[PDB]
Amino acid sequence: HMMLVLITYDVQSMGGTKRLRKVAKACQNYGQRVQNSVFECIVDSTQLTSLKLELTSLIDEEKDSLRIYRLGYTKVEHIGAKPS
Amino acid sequence: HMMLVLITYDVQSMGGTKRLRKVAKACQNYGQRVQNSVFECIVDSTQLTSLKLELTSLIDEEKDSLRIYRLGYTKVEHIGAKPS
Incomplete structure (x- = not known):
């Protein structure tokens, strides 16, 4: 029923900082930010799909990557330490 | 017997760049770098302990974090994309 999902976001720049803010907000809807760009989410199958579509849409695919x-x-x- | 281990390194600076190089070299002994600061290692229990001691010793604990x-x-x- 529920799944633990780890999301690792490799992002650098002004655009990068903006995209990280948006990715962090999207992941916060389903979990916690455990490092600057690592998120732990607890989701059902529907929520995982929704979140993954949203994250894919937010990144710059030439400059960034996500692993799920x-x-x-x-x-x-x-x-x-941290994170901030 | 063997375990898959994911290592996520939150590092920023000159020292940071140096520490990332060292952490990447340590993890490469047991696996692959899949993003700039995310590593996938396949290890037995002894190797995991050895690697974890080494990584703990390499980071700046005021400025960096690792999750294993x-x-x-x-x-x-x-x-x-990537990683480089």
């Missing part, structure tokens, strides 16, 4: 990991869910270890 | 996800392993979707 379906985790199905084991302690994740966080090492170091 | 143990995936146990479902198509990951890559959207957009």
Whole structure:
């Protein structure tokens, strides 16, 4: 029924900063920002599709990438500071 | 026996660029760089510990963070370009 999904956004620039803000807002609707451009979302199948379409539409595909990991869910270890 | 591990490195600066190079080299010993600062490693338990100690030692814990996800392993979707 519910899935944990990890979204990793590789973004650099003015456009980049703007796109990160938008991607973060879209992911926040379904989860939490755990690093500057890494998001953990908990979603059903319909919500995953909706979110993935939205994220695909927000990035610059020449300059950015996203990876979407379906985790199905084991302690994740966080090492170091933040995020802001 | 073997585990897939995802390593997400939140790093910014001159020191940052240097630390990313070192983290990437450490992860390359056990896997692949799939985005600028995201690495997929396949490791046994001993290798995971060794790698995690090494990564912890390389980062600046005031300015950077790492997350280490143990995936146990479902198509990951890559959207957009790269990495360099």
